[PDB]
Amino acid sequence: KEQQEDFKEAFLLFDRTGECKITLSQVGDVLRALGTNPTNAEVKKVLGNPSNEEMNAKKIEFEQFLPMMQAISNNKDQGGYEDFVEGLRVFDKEGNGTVMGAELRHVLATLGEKMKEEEVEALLAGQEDSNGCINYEAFVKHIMSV
Amino acid sequence: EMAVFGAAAPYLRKSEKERLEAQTRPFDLKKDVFVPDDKQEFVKAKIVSREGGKVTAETEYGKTVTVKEDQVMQQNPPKFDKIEDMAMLTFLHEPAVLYNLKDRYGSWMIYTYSGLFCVTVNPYKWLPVYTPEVVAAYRGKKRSEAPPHIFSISDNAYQYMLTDRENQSILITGESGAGKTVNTKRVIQYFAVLEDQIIQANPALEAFGNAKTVRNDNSSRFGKFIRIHFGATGKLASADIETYLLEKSRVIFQLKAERDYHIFYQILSNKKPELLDMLLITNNPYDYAFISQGETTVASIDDAEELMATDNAFDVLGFTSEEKNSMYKLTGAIMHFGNMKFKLKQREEQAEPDGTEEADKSAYLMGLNSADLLKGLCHPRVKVGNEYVTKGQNVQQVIYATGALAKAVYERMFNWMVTRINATLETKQPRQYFIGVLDIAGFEIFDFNSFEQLCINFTNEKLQQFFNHHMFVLEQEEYKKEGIEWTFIDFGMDLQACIDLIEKPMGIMSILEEECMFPKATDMTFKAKLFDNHLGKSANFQKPRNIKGKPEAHFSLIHYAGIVDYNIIGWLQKNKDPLNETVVGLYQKSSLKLLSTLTVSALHRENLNKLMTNLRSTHPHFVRCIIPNETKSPGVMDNPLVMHQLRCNGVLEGIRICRKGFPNRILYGDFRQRYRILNPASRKGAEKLLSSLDIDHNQYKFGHTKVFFKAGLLGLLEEMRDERLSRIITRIQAQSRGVL
Ligand SMILES: Nc1ncnc2c1ncn2[C@@H]1O[C@H](COP(=O)(O)OP(=O)(O)O)[C@@H](O)[C@H]1O
Ligand SMILES: [Mg+2]
């Protein structure tokens, strides 16, 4: 029950209205700050795959949020060091342990899911060497350690 | 960078952005296929809807026709189109090759690799790819990295000669007009970097060894083999030229829609009146039997300009002017022979001459005696035991003899001319490890295939058998090196049936030669004997076909390209080769160049066997040339014609033979270090991952230095790697969202 107590304390702390109510846009952020790394599919299916208009319209309370985190805690798909390093090594053309920053930016903007520039720039802030390359080993240490 | 070439770089290889945009070409493989058409008989379409056995598809041109679902084949994915080399095509299909070739040619792309071949299409305009800077760039470039080009294979052959110390040969064969001569000229200047002499002589050889076909106006009937004799250090030393398979039937006989060789018509042009005056030529082609029966003249060539070009080639060259005058004299004499009439002596089978004035002109031309020539022709003398005895000849026999003599002297003229230019070009520098460059006519399949077409088809069949044997030898050597063998069956017997039907005893040519010596043999008897000895007994032989009202056919064969029907009429008249000997003595007793001068199927067979035994000593290299369209419009190309030529050239069969084994061979270490992304946990790990891939192990073979497997396994591995890395990217995005 203590874990539920912490969940509700975080929920009310993140509640700016005092009604233990949040929006759908921030439910994923709350879940991730509570120890999850889900994809958009996971956060949409728990809500029933709502549309864009319903995404920014409806609001969810802590009582209705409890099943979401209860089910998410049953998922153990979070990745690992080996998979991330193997994925980032293919971009290491010279194979010294570094990846081109510009190529990483372009593939992030085109391949996979595009993300806002500021968050990724802060994530890589100080993670790139003087040559404009990012040592993907230290980058992996940085991203998953937090 | 690809920018070394500069001006030609876009033509040689496209840039990255075009490849990227074409890769994302949105198409669903489940709805776009290839459907047969009516006039092109191969088109692309997308299925509007599936209605069971019959499916309705919309084509690019725009049509609402429907076809049975069994006649539609899979279409190559857009992510893999416009490939530089189509050897590893994901879905090999007969129209897929045509589609890829036309898509490339649309981007103005000429050279394309097809495994061991090098397919090139013929445009009609100047291109910058032959810039000397490009030649320097290709110097030392291998087949893989460099874009497709003939210079790449030439450099590969040069490197093979350097590293193995053995002769190398490059063979070119395509449909007449595919531009083989031009390609040979480009490659010979590439080697040069004497070639000026080669190009200077080329017009003469072309004029003396070409005629207008129903499909082409400057067909090269005979084959050419140019040998570049190098030095011990691989420096150009000298050049030789050899000619094989000259068509005497062309000189003796012509078809309804066919011309004779260019030379006769050139001299028939009056823009050199002195030659006509000294040759006693009336300037009327219809007055000479040997030429009239063909096609009088065509407007595609101005004749006189070609005559001046040939005269310039002769005059400024190693030989003098009186020799040229003698050559013209003898050609005119050959022309004269088509006017004798003869007549069977009353109450006798011997035949005597009537128009004893053409004989006078011919004898004056050769300096012989008209009476002596007539007596020799009418009453030839042969030495039996130790005494000379006369022989009897009827009108038919003497006609055949004179035709054979004329064609033989023409062939000897051609050979002597080749020898003369070769001697002029040759120089006394050391000669070592010659590189051969052969060009020959293609696997022509007209609507009225005849004996000459049969000979060309037999030669092409032999060449294809040689190619298959070379592929088998290479694959077996590779397997022996790798210590594992697969499909240890040679491909020669996969093609030997046609050769057996053609050349071996009781074959078509043997049977024809048997008819030649039979007392009374006619075409009807020839067909009857062919059917009796081969109908049903031999799989290849079969009855003729009557489709869309072809003129006529008598029998058919199953070549490596397809079913081809031939004709019989006239073959006996076109195969007889009685070479009189007394007239040979008269020529050898002549005050002219003739002193230096001295059955068709058998001589052709001997020449072909000489060619094959010469070629076997050299390591081969193969090129393919295909015309895009009948009209000279460069951009447009006719799909049926291109597909027919692709079938004829046997690119598809070659790539299929390659695919029969395990073409995909990858270094074990490279595979372990590259494709381990698929199953993330250099030999133990490689085999562990391969076993744990959860795929049937019959598809792939486990080696020691190179892992082998079929393209089906490779494609599945690549696509599952793609989806796995997509999943990894999605997980990375989820982690980044978690960071937020
Ligand atoms: N590299 C090329 N660029 C442009 N046209 C070419 C090229 N190669 C061949 N051709 C075309 O091919 C024709 C000559 O073909 P040719 O070599 O005589 O055929 P064949 O070898 O059957 O005699 C010319 O009219 C020319 O326009
Ligand atoms: Mg030619």
PDB file of N, CA and C in Angstrom, chain A residues 3-4 7 31 36 46 64-75:
ATOM      1  N   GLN A   3       3.492   1.830  -1.817  1.00  0.00           N
ATOM      2  CA  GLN A   3       3.714   2.228  -3.204  1.00  0.00           C
ATOM      3  C   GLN A   3       2.512   2.987  -3.755  1.00  0.00           C
ATOM      4  N   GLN A   4       1.297   2.539  -3.429  1.00  0.00           N
ATOM      5  CA  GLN A   4       0.110   3.290  -3.827  1.00  0.00           C
ATOM      6  C   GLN A   4       0.087   4.663  -3.168  1.00  0.00           C
ATOM      7  N   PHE A   7       2.341   6.783  -5.134  1.00  0.00           N
ATOM      8  CA  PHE A   7       1.714   7.112  -6.410  1.00  0.00           C
ATOM      9  C   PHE A   7       0.722   8.257  -6.248  1.00  0.00           C
ATOM     10  N   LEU A  31       3.603   8.607 -15.746  1.00  0.00           N
ATOM     11  CA  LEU A  31       3.958   7.193 -15.697  1.00  0.00           C
ATOM     12  C   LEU A  31       5.461   7.002 -15.841  1.00  0.00           C
ATOM     13  N   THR A  36       8.586   4.130 -15.606  1.00  0.00           N
ATOM     14  CA  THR A  36       8.190   3.399 -16.801  1.00  0.00           C
ATOM     15  C   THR A  36       8.795   4.057 -18.034  1.00  0.00           C
ATOM     16  N   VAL A  46      -4.055   1.934 -23.319  1.00  0.00           N
ATOM     17  CA  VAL A  46      -4.622   2.005 -21.976  1.00  0.00           C
ATOM     18  C   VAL A  46      -5.793   2.979 -21.941  1.00  0.00           C
ATOM     19  N   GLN A  64      -9.100   6.638 -11.752  1.00  0.00           N
ATOM     20  CA  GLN A  64      -9.102   6.052 -13.085  1.00  0.00           C
ATOM     21  C   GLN A  64      -7.696   5.793 -13.608  1.00  0.00           C
ATOM     22  N   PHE A  65      -6.682   6.439 -13.028  1.00  0.00           N
ATOM     23  CA  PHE A  65      -5.300   6.202 -13.423  1.00  0.00           C
ATOM     24  C   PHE A  65      -4.703   4.965 -12.764  1.00  0.00           C
ATOM     25  N   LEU A  66      -5.242   4.541 -11.621  1.00  0.00           N
ATOM     26  CA  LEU A  66      -4.674   3.395 -10.915  1.00  0.00           C
ATOM     27  C   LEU A  66      -4.599   2.154 -11.792  1.00  0.00           C
ATOM     28  N   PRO A  67      -5.646   1.768 -12.527  1.00  0.00           N
ATOM     29  CA  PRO A  67      -5.514   0.598 -13.410  1.00  0.00           C
ATOM     30  C   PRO A  67      -4.411   0.745 -14.440  1.00  0.00           C
ATOM     31  N   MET A  68      -4.178   1.955 -14.951  1.00  0.00           N
ATOM     32  CA  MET A  68      -3.139   2.136 -15.962  1.00  0.00           C
ATOM     33  C   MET A  68      -1.769   1.759 -15.410  1.00  0.00           C
ATOM     34  N   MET A  69      -1.393   2.326 -14.261  1.00  0.00           N
ATOM     35  CA  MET A  69      -0.090   1.995 -13.693  1.00  0.00           C
ATOM     36  C   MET A  69      -0.051   0.555 -13.200  1.00  0.00           C
ATOM     37  N   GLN A  70      -1.176   0.039 -12.696  1.00  0.00           N
ATOM     38  CA  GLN A  70      -1.210  -1.352 -12.257  1.00  0.00           C
ATOM     39  C   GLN A  70      -0.905  -2.298 -13.411  1.00  0.00           C
ATOM     40  N   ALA A  71      -1.471  -2.027 -14.590  1.00  0.00           N
ATOM     41  CA  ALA A  71      -1.198  -2.857 -15.757  1.00  0.00           C
ATOM     42  C   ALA A  71       0.192  -2.606 -16.327  1.00  0.00           C
ATOM     43  N   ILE A  72       0.672  -1.362 -16.279  1.00  0.00           N
ATOM     44  CA  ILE A  72       1.994  -1.058 -16.818  1.00  0.00           C
ATOM     45  C   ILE A  72       3.077  -1.739 -15.993  1.00  0.00           C
ATOM     46  N   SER A  73       2.892  -1.803 -14.671  1.00  0.00           N
ATOM     47  CA  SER A  73       3.870  -2.468 -13.819  1.00  0.00           C
ATOM     48  C   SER A  73       4.030  -3.938 -14.177  1.00  0.00           C
ATOM     49  N   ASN A  74       3.034  -4.536 -14.831  1.00  0.00           N
ATOM     50  CA  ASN A  74       3.129  -5.921 -15.269  1.00  0.00           C
ATOM     51  C   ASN A  74       3.945  -6.083 -16.543  1.00  0.00           C
ATOM     52  N   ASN A  75       4.333  -4.988 -17.190  1.00  0.00           N
ATOM     53  CA  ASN A  75       5.135  -5.031 -18.405  1.00  0.00           C
ATOM     54  C   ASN A  75       6.603  -4.834 -18.047  1.00  0.00           C
TER      55      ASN A  75
END
